[PDB]
Amino acid sequence: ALGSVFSVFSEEGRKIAICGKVNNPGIIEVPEGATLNEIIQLCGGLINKSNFKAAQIGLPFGGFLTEDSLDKEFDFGIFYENIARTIIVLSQEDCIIQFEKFYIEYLLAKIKDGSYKNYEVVKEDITEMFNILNRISKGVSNMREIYLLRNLAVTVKSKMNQKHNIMEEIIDKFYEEIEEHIEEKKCYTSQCNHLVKLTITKKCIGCGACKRACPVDCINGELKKKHEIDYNRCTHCGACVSACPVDAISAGDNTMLFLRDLATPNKVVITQMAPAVRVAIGEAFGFEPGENVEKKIAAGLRKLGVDYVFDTSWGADLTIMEEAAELQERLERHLAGDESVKLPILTSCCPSWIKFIEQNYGDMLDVPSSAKSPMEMFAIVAKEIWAKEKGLSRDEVTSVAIMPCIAKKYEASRAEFSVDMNYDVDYVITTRELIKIFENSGINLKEIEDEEIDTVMGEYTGAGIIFGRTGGVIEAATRTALEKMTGERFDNIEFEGLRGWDGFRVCELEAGDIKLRIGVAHGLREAAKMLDKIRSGEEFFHAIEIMACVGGCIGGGGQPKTKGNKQAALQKRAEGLNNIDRSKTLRRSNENPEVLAIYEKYLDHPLSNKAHELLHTVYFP
Amino acid sequence: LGSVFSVFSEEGRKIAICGKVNNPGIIEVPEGANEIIQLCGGLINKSNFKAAQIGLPFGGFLTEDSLDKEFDFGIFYENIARTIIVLSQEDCIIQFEKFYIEYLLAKIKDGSYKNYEVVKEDITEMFNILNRISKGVSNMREIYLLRNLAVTVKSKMNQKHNIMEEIIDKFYEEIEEHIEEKKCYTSQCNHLVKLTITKKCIGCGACKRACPVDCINGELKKKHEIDYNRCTHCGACVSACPVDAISAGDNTMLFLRDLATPNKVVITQMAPAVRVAIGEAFGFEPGENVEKKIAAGLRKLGVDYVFDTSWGADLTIMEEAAELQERLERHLAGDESVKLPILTSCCPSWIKFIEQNYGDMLDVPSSAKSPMEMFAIVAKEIWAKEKGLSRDEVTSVAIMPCIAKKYEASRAEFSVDMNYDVDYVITTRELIKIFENSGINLKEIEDEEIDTVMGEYTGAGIIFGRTGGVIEAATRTALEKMTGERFDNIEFEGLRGWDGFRVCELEAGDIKLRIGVAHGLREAAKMLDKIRSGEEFFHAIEIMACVGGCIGGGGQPKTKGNKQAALQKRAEGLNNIDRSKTLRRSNENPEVLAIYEKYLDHPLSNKAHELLHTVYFP
Numbered sequence A: 001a002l003g004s005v006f007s008v009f010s011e012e013g014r015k016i017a018i019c020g021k022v023n024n025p026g027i028i029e030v031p032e033g034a035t036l037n038e039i040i041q042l043c044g045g046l047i048n049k050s051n052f053k054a055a056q057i058g059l060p061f062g063g064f065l066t067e068d069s070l071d072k073e074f075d076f077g078i079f080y081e082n083i084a085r086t087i088i089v090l091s092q093e094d095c096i097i098q099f100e101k102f103y104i105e106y107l108l109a110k111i112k113d114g115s116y117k118n119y120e121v122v123k124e125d126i127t128e129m130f131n132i133l134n135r136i137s138k139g140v141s142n143m144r145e146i147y148l149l150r151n152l153a154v155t156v157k158s159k160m161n162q163k164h165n166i167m168e169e170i171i172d173k174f175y176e177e178i179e180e181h182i183e184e185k186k187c188y189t190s191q192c193n194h195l196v197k198l199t200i201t202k203k204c205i206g207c208g209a210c211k212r213a214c215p216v217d218c219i220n221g222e223l224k225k226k227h228e229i230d231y232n233r234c235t236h237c238g239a240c241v242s243a244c245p246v247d248a249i250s251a252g253d254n255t256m257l258f259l260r261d262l263a264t265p266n267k268v269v270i271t272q273m274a275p276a277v278r279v280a281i282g283e284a285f286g287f288e289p290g291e292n293v294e295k296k297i298a299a300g301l302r303k304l305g306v307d308y309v310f311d312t313s314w315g316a317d318l319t320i321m322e323e324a325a326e327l328q329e330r331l332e333r334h335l336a337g338d339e340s341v342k343l344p345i346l347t348s349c350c351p352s353w354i355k356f357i358e359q360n361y362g363d364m365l366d367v368p369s370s371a372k373s374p375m376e377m378f379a380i381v382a383k384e385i386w387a388k389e390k391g392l393s394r395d396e397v398t399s400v401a402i403m404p405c406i407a408k409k410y411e412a413s414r415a416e417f418s419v420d421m422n423y424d425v426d427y428v429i430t431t432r433e434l435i436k437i438f439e440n441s442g443i444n445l446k447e448i449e450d451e452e453i454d455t456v457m458g459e460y461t462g463a464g465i466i467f468g469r470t471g472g473v474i475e476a477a478t479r480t481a482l483e484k485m486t487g488e489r490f491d492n493i494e495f496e497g498l499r500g501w502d503g504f505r506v507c508e509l510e511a512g513d514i515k516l517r518i519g520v521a522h523g524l525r526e527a528a529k530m531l532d533k534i535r536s537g538e539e540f541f542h543a544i545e546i547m548a549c550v551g552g553c554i555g556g557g558g559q560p561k562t563k564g565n566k567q568a569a570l571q572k573r574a575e576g577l578n579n580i581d582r583s584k585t586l587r588r589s590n591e592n593p594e595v596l597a598i599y600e601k602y603l604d605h606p607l608s609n610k611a612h613e614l615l616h617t618v619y620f621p
Numbered sequence B: 001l002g003s004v005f006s007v008f009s010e011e012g013r014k015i016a017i018c019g020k021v022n023n024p025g026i027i028e029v030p031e032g033a034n035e036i037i038q039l040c041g042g043l044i045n046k047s048n049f050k051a052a053q054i055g056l057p058f059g060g061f062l063t064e065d066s067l068d069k070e071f072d073f074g075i076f077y078e079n080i081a082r083t084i085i086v087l088s089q090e091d092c093i094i095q096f097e098k099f100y101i102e103y104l105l106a107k108i109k110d111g112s113y114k115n116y117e118v119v120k121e122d123i124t125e126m127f128n129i130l131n132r133i134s135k136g137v138s139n140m141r142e143i144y145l146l147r148n149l150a151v152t153v154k155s156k157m158n159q160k161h162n163i164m165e166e167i168i169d170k171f172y173e174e175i176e177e178h179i180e181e182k183k184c185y186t187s188q189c190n191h192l193v194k195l196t197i198t199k200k201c202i203g204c205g206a207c208k209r210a211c212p213v214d215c216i217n218g219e220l221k222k223k224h225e226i227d228y229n230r231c232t233h234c235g236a237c238v239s240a241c242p243v244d245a246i247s248a249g250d251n252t253m254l255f256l257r258d259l260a261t262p263n264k265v266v267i268t269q270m271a272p273a274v275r276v277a278i279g280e281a282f283g284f285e286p287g288e289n290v291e292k293k294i295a296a297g298l299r300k301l302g303v304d305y306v307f308d309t310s311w312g313a314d315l316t317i318m319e320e321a322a323e324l325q326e327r328l329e330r331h332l333a334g335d336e337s338v339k340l341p342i343l344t345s346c347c348p349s350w351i352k353f354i355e356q357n358y359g360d361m362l363d364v365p366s367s368a369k370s371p372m373e374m375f376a377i378v379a380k381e382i383w384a385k386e387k388g389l390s391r392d393e394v395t396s397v398a399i400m401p402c403i404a405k406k407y408e409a410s411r412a413e414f415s416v417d418m419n420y421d422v423d424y425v426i427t428t429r430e431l432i433k434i435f436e437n438s439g440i441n442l443k444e445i446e447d448e449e450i451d452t453v454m455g456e457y458t459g460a461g462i463i464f465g466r467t468g469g470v471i472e473a474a475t476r477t478a479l480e481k482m483t484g485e486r487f488d489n490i491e492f493e494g495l496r497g498w499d500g501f502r503v504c505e506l507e508a509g510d511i512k513l514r515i516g517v518a519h520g521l522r523e524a525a526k527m528l529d530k531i532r533s534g535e536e537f538f539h540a541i542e543i544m545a546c547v548g549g550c551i552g553g554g555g556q557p558k559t560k561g562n563k564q565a566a567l568q569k570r571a572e573g574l575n576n577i578d579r580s581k582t583l584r585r586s587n588e589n590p591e592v593l594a595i596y597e598k599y600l601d602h603p604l605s606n607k608a609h610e611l612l613h614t615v616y617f618p
């Protein structure tokens, strides 16, 4: 396979394969008398105009060139016996630590499969090198690591009887960057997703759209003065990023890491995708909003190198099991006169409300459900159950989430969703990022064959799929809970009261002896209105749903920019999800056989101790 | 093997009780029909029964259900092992299960029970999980994992009651507490313990008056609380409390358990000031150096290697004198980017003292680590490597005179992959009680030598323990190297003395340096205020939180007779150790020089910064 480019392209004598940070990666015929720089120019320079940093020769083994070799004739002697003649070019926009992690993991794979048994003796040593790099990338290291790396490098150079080990020169030439990463916990290229915080960059022109758009008044700054984010109050709703006319606000971009992981041999890569992605991505390829192209996305992902493709709506069904259980418990306790219970119960997978409450509604910390999000539920099940059944350690599986927003990036970055430095969601990719991957890689969703999603964690019901538009989470929870409480199967499962588009909606649901009052908000200002009304006693609710983005996750800032009327397109996506729900035979989360298998085999019933241990978390510790 | 609070090391129809029983030991047990403990003298304090392990390698686990009911004699499993570990409500279950797992793993690894080989990694993983809980880096999911691991083992061991399952079932509350609330209600998990005022507080206000930084809020008799964000861990509040209301943990039991773990390498370092005060508990006068007595006692306890912190102090002097020479050369060269004075002190208490009140002086202190952390990092990254041991196969224990060193060793900057360079700290009083209850009398035991590679030290290093010693040693080395002249008289009496704030005026060749010394954080505040106002200029300063320096630490034995006289006796004792040494400059120590020649290659090198330097005020 092999390949790399910022706009992303996995490209599957006197001929070389250039795949670095150059524009137009490809196979090139080198003129006789040519420098490195001239080869770069024949490929069109480096993405943007970031200057040359280094060039790796041979992916398993070769040389490592820096500026000192840029204007010198490219001696082919560096292509020693059976090197395959490959060059990875680096610009100043690439982090050395991530690249060296990729190099070490590649070498380790080729050792482990027996292609390079002569290097077996150093396996353990090299593994430690990776671990050291990993500790640096996660920000859990001291400067001592450098010392260790050096000795390890020296160790390798002793056992391989080699005159030049790569890591020694790497340390010598980029000590400044390494020290920056370690002491300042900063990656100046923003490739280390665990060291990146949502920040306004130096490019900012002091316009102001972000200062107006923030619903919590989190941004300070006036006139052309650079604006700053009070990160201790940021909800990661992404309004500022979407409203910025420029690249002034950065929250990272995990595309290159995805490509490198896909290009690592014998590395298991699995993906989940949010309900709302499948009704919007196709817009970039000639489909209308609302058209479900999940099979096209599955085919494209598998073409890219994904070994297993799963679905977040399975996790949404599991979330519904847990949340309907908790809601019924709370209602039963309330009807019994239990004042220890707290109402309403908040059901929402949106992270944005967490801080939104912590910073303005400390009297309602007992309201939201303890259940994790569908994304993290999927991740924990994939790594702690699915992988275990297949005999894989959690670090032997790379779980990638395809989601419509940056708040999911922040969620996947939370340490609560990790163990032994392994994050349940390894990293998050936005809809736009995947669109650009497909576009630059030649994947056209309009013309690719359909492929099925994998079964164990891909099958989902309509209740789960409606999660992606406002009112879906509470609608699914209500379906299951009311059917559970009344014993009655509803002829019409759609609750039109919970649907609609008003920022703040009130509904009244009647079923047998059971009567519930529901409040729904999309847009954090409407949410503030609703919560102020609840606190003042102006309105009483049994349950509420809060979404930060208008229309729900189908309206996330990571989705493709709408064409035509924005509101019309968002409504089209929502009705597309509703039509997916209507096309499914099963339309209650509790009918999904695979979630029930999860309960029958491991957790034994919803809200059990095991279910709490795995699928629940502590918001507001 | 042995274990009990207040310490003990106890090195057919026969039983060996060694848990939380008062008066541990073997016991001819009668065959008559809860009061079993009473025949052994009850439990330490009056703490209620929690559980009892039968057989140390493997056996049964008894809980309260057998307490007031017929305790069947024969139920002692055929592999009873004739040993019993009884647990009280004062013991953390997580630490006990860690000790059990490590004992089992060691006895597997030495071949004593090959039949358990199949479960090794499994059991090992359990330990790791427990460790993550004890270090506070876990979610509730760990419980899930543990359960399944247990289920696996019980299948292969075909056991009717697996120990981990019963642990989860009966002590779920404690595990959930540890994980979600990051709280060990027995305070055995040293990494979850913070300096706190307990419920025994009555509201004296002694703590509020004694604190030099006004870190305690509260009025009347209302319970007082510590604002941890400003605490210097000087320990004045602990000493001043009329009760035991303020607790900062006690790693005695962990030390005993590690010593009782087979094939576990335990090494120790000791602060300079310990050796002139500990002997007071055994009839020695203040100032008498009993370092050999301490070494012999530690070896009797089971310690495999005994080292000295003064070696690390010599290394620290090397680095700090290098930095001072660099800074003075730059200042004399007209470099205004440089910062003076330079602060030389291994006391952590000034860190928070400056960051919260002197943010204009963050570039003053040297980037050099403390001697304790330098010793720890060298022991684990070089010494252990030389002897072919991973850092987790070595347990480094620091014997220090204060609580601030516990908090320092607990800092994440001095750790890697959850392994802390200083695994835990033992105070002088704690070691005194260990010796007292184990029958070790330092005035009545043979002398033993300290281990060499990291134990030999100079007088410059040893004077660290009393006020003015750190700066005196740094000045000795730096001036001797800067002038090329070896001083006939190496003692700088101006830096000695007992005043809270001392000023010195040092001349050597063309060099004239102005020095400021403070012991007591209020006197230090006076000095730093004077520096800020420009009333006085200093080239270097030394700050000690405790009066007299570390010899006056809150972890030292309470003085007998006149306090000031005793502290002066200890300080002059350290000075007399210095006077008895052939080498009295840190740069003469062959082992530190070997460290430089073989690994770091010169002071202030890149490797020296990587290992022996840290970033205060990140």
Ligand code: 402
Binding pocket: A273, A274, A275, A276, A277, A312, A313, A315, A316, A348, A349, A350, A351, A373, A374, A375, A376, A403, A404, A405, A408, A467, A468, A469, A473, A552, A553, A554, A556
């Ligand atoms: N986690 C989760 Fe959600 C689920 O299911 C997604 O995945 Fe959303 C979508 N689509 C996103 O992003 S988050 C907020 N709740 C509504 S939907």
Ligand code: 402
Binding pocket: B270, B271, B272, B273, B274, B309, B310, B312, B313, B345, B346, B347, B348, B370, B371, B372, B373, B400, B401, B402, B405, B461, B464, B465, B466, B470, B549, B550, B551, B553
């Ligand atoms: N670290 C260190 Fe120090 C050294 O050397 C000790 O060990 Fe002190 C002593 N004695 C203690 O406690 S800390 C403060 N500096 C003066 S001395």
Ligand code: SF4
Binding pocket: A200, A204, A205, A206, A207, A208, A209, A210, A211, A226, A227, A243, A244, A245, A246, A248, A249
């Ligand atoms: S929008 Fe982009 S540019 Fe305009 S202010 Fe906010 S950040 Fe600066």
Ligand code: SF4
Binding pocket: A210, A213, A214, A215, A216, A217, A218, A219, A229, A233, A234, A235, A236, A237, A238, A239, A240, A241
């Ligand atoms: S993200 Fe939402 S909240 Fe955080 S700053 Fe940008 S707008 Fe304000």
Ligand code: SF4
Binding pocket: A237, A349, A350, A351, A352, A404, A405, A406, A407, A408, A547, A548, A549, A552, A553, A554, A555, A556, A557
């Ligand atoms: S609503 Fe907008 S922000 Fe909240 S989760 Fe769905 S997408 Fe992310």
Ligand code: SF4
Binding pocket: B197, B200, B201, B202, B203, B204, B205, B206, B207, B208, B223, B224, B240, B241, B242, B243, B245, B246
């Ligand atoms: S006991 Fe110690 S803490 Fe409690 S009040 Fe008196 S002084 Fe303050």
Ligand code: SF4
Binding pocket: B210, B211, B212, B213, B214, B215, B216, B226, B230, B231, B232, B233, B234, B235, B236, B237, B238
């Ligand atoms: S420790 Fe020192 S500083 Fe912290 S509270 Fe007690 S006295 Fe005040």
Ligand code: SF4
Binding pocket: B233, B234, B346, B347, B348, B349, B401, B402, B403, B404, B405, B544, B545, B546, B549, B550, B551, B552, B553, B554
């Ligand atoms: S002076 Fe020595 S003992 Fe007293 S606190 Fe500072 S360091 Fe600990």
Ligand SMILES: [Cl-]
Binding pocket: A156, A165, A166, A167
């Ligand atoms: Cl290598």
Ligand SMILES: [Cl-]
Binding pocket: A196, A197, A198, A251, A252, A406, A409, A410
């Ligand atoms: Cl972010």
Ligand SMILES: [Cl-]
Binding pocket: A262, A263, A264, A266, A267, A268, A269, A305, A306, A307
């Ligand atoms: Cl692959």
Ligand SMILES: [Cl-]
Binding pocket: A385, A386, A389, A456
């Ligand atoms: Cl499965």
Ligand SMILES: [Cl-]
Binding pocket: A452, A453, A454, A455
């Ligand atoms: Cl299918």
Ligand SMILES: [Cl-]
Binding pocket: A555, A556, A557, A559, A560, A561, A562
């Ligand atoms: Cl959009």
Ligand SMILES: [Cl-]
Binding pocket: B258, B259, B260, B261, B263, B264, B265, B266, B302, B303, B304
């Ligand atoms: Cl031992």
Ligand SMILES: [Cl-]
Binding pocket: B449, B450, B451, B452, B456
């Ligand atoms: Cl000796």
